Structure 1
């Protein structure tokens, strides 16, 4: 099974993508991620995506 650096934060309240650093904060605290940010998908719907890799 491929190890993927990024994973959508399941069921995250997208409204929080409006808050600076909030997806990053919640990814790191709630998921032990290295970081997180919100991203627009191909239809421009926002999702909070956690990142488990270092850069």
Structure 2
């Protein structure tokens, strides 16, 4: 039972960074594995997933 959300508002240039995504995600979104991935529109965005046992 977890949740996820994408914020296109964020800079795509950061997508290249793997430690930057989760850093900005786990920061505000308090996610756990915040990372970016190609969307259905071939658009690269940073998605944040928040899960709590």
TM interval, short-chain normalised: 0.7 to 0.9
Kept after mapping to 2: 8 A contact 1:8/1:50: yes
In 1, the alpha carbon distance for the partners of 2:52 and 2:6 equals 17
Task: Give the structure-2-normalised TM-score.
Answer: 0.74
Q: Name the structure where helix makes up a greater proportion of residues.
A: 2
Task: Give the structure-1-normalised TM-score.
Answer: 0.72
Q: How far has the Cα of 1:17 moved from its partner?
A: 0.5
Q: What's the Cα RMSD here?
A: 2.0
Show structure 2 runs of 5+ residues with no match: none
1:23 aligns with 2:13: no
Show structure 1 runs of 5+ residues with no match: none
Kept after mapping to 2: 8 A contact 1:25/1:35: no
Q: Name the structure where strand makes up a greater proportion of residues.
A: 2
Q: How far has the Cα of 1:34 moved from its partner?
A: 1.8
How many residues were matched structurally?
51
